[PDB]
């Protein structure tokens, strides 16, 4: 209900955010801060190396970082943030 009706605030293409990461699922990092949402920053960006990266080595656990949206689906609640910016 509450985050997902008017999900146009941080939308427009690249609004940078400061978000604490929660759990890094070996494909992802799960930074999610903006009032009950979920972001990923999965593994492809994260750095400027693609595949050999393993996100636990490269950033942190529980830390507020540089992230912005890059993509929102307000329907299948997958805001797909990035970190290579």
């Amino acid at each position: 209900e509450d985050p997902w009706v008017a999900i146009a605030k941080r939308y427009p293409e690249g609004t940078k955010l400061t978000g604490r990461v929660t759990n890094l699922t070996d494909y992802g990092c799960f930074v999610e801060i903006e009032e009950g949402v979920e972001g990923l920053v999965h593994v492809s960006e994260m750095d400027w190396t693609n595949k050999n990266i393993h996100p636990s080595k490269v950033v942190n656990v529980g830390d507020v970082v540089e992230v912005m949206v890059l993509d929102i689906d307000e329907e299948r609640r997958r805001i797909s943030l990035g970190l290579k910016q």
Binding site: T15, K16, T18, I33
Partner: protein, 173 residues
């Protein structure tokens, strides 16, 4: 007897769930693990990085007291969520304090907008605010000496998701 029952409800009365009551005494330090004891079932494995202030080195020796947090119990063995979030509540209280006199005054120094609002940092933490909040008018701190000293006058806060944009320079306003 009922000494113990009364002692139990007493000890219920003299603790709460969040990181509120500054109770854990730091009883062993080793890099890179701090550990306390706030009257919980076990001792916290604290990072060192919830406790170094603003330039990288530690601030608290043995006996020192910070509250941590709670509401999560037993992942196998151990007890807490980190005390640094604790700190967030204190920050929230100072931000709330504004409401009383309609003006929270500290220092806010905001050089640039990651997402349309200058970033303001208070003490150790740095927060992001919407673009208007940084400047009272159209002054723009890009011409101001870099990472300048003002305070923060609040422009906008999102109240659920935590984004706060604050008012650099223009003391008169």
């Amino acid at each position: 007897e009922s000494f113990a029952q009364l002692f139990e409800e007493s000890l219920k009365e003299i603790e709460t769930r969040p990181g509120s009551i500054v109770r854990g005494v730091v009883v062993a330090i080793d890099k890179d693990v701090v550990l306390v004891d706030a009257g919980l079932k076990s001792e916290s494995a604290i990072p060192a990085e919830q406790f170094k202030n603003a330039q990288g080195e530690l601030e608290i020796q043995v006996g020192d007291e910070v509250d941590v947090a709670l509401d999560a119990v037993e992942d196998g063995f151990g007890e807490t969520l980190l005390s640094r979030e604790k700190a967030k509540r204190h920050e929230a209280w100072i931000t709330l304090e504004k409401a009383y006199e309609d003006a929270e005054t500290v220092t806010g120094v905001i050089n640039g907008k990651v997402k349309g609002g200058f970033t303001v940092e208070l003490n150790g933490i740095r927060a992001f605010l919407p673009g208007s909040l940084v400047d009272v008018r159209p002054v723009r701190d890009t011409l101001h000496l870099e990472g300048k000293e003002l305070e923060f006058k609040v422009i906008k806060l999102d109240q659920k998701r935590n984004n706060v944009v604050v008012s650099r320079r223009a003391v008169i306003e």
